[PDB]
Amino acid sequence: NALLTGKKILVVDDNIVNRRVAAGALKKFGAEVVCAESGQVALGLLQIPHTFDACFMDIQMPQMDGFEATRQIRMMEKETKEKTNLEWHLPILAMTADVIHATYEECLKSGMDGYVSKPF
Amino acid sequence: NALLTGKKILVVDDNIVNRRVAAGALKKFGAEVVCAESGQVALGLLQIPHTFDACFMDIQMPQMDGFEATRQIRMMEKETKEKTNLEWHLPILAMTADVIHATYEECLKSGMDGYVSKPFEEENLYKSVAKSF
Ligand SMILES: [K+]
Ligand SMILES: [K+]
């Protein structure tokens, strides 16, 4: 509960800056981190059984986005449930930062002066 | 005498709940509020010269979104500056909540267990230096 020692985290992101920064953040608390740059690579790493304890899922990726990739992880797990009678549920947290920042850049680009924080 | 007393706010939003909430809230601070359901209505209300002190701009609207409408509010001001030399710069604040809500609803629908709001900050950020050749 204080450190991530003994945990293995999958970071999926198609931005090399995100992959490097997330991994260093998680490694500073002792996580073993594996990075994937695409949904296909992530699905290949998540063949059941795998040893990952949690996954950070970039929602915006070409060819397969994070929603699709998640849908297929859940299909993989449902298949395993049916054939092994054990329930696999990898924790998956979406990484949305790049949808929100892109949104803020179009606001500024269009000429808006700011935005409402925690808006109406 | 309340905080926005004497101020007139244009709320542009195509969702009736936001219009009702934004306007009620702003009126409690003493603002006179006008609501618009579309960018075209907003552009019509912002004929220069106008009496609006601020504008809240829904970024996601059919037919004309808030970026477009903003883009044309700025052309109006630039045209005025060019032709009259008078400086108009309406304050425009983006309303982005419903884009974040939809994204968050899509995460749930796909099967994710949650989301990270704030991005990963890097540790030694202001610790970098400019090194000279
Ligand atoms: K991305
Ligand atoms: K909207």
Structural class of chain A: alpha/beta
The percentage of residues in β strands of chain A lies in 15-25%
How do the strands of the widest beta sheet of chain A line up side by side? 2-1-3-4
Report the CATH C-level class of chain A.
Alpha Beta
User: Major β-sheet of chain A, in short?
Assistant: 4 strands, parallel
- First-last Cα distance of chain A: 35 Å
What is the CATH homology-level superfamily of chain A? Response regulator
Shape of chain A: globular
Tell me the radius of gyration of chain A.
Answer: 17 Å
Q: What name is given to the CATH topology of chain A?
A: Rossmann fold
Annotation field: number of helices of chain A: 4
- Biggest interface, CB < 8 A: A-B, 41 and 42 residues
Helices and strands of chain A, in order, run as EHEHEHEHE
- Total strands of chain A: the figure is 5
Task: Write down the oligomeric state.
Answer: homodimer
Count of discrete structural domains of chain A: 1
Q: What are the distinct ligands in this entry? A: potassium ion
CATH architecture level-2 label of chain A: 3-Layer(aba) Sandwich
Q: Determine the fraction of residues in helical runs of chain A and give it as a percent range.
A: 40-55%
How would you describe this protein?
The structure is a homodimer. With 120 residues, chain A is α/β, with parallel strands linked by helices. Chain A has one domain (8-110): Rossmann fold (3-Layer(aba) Sandwich). The first copy, chain A, is built from 4 helices and 5 strands. Chain A has helices at residues 16-28, 39-45, 66-84, 97-110; strands at residues 8-12, 32-36, 54-58, 92-95, 114-115. Chain A has a 4-stranded parallel beta sheet with strand order 2-1-3-4, sandwiched between helices. In chain A, helix 2 runs parallel beside helix 3. The A-B interface holds A 18, 21-22, 24-25, 28, 56-57, 59, 66-68, 70-71, 73-74, 91-101, 103-104, 106-107, 109-116, 119-120 and B 18, 21-22, 25, 56-57, 59, 66-68, 70-71, 73-74, 91-97, 99-100, 103-104, 106-107, 109-123. Bound molecules: potassium ion (2 copies). Residues 14-15, 58, 60-61, 98 of chain B line the site of one potassium ion (K).
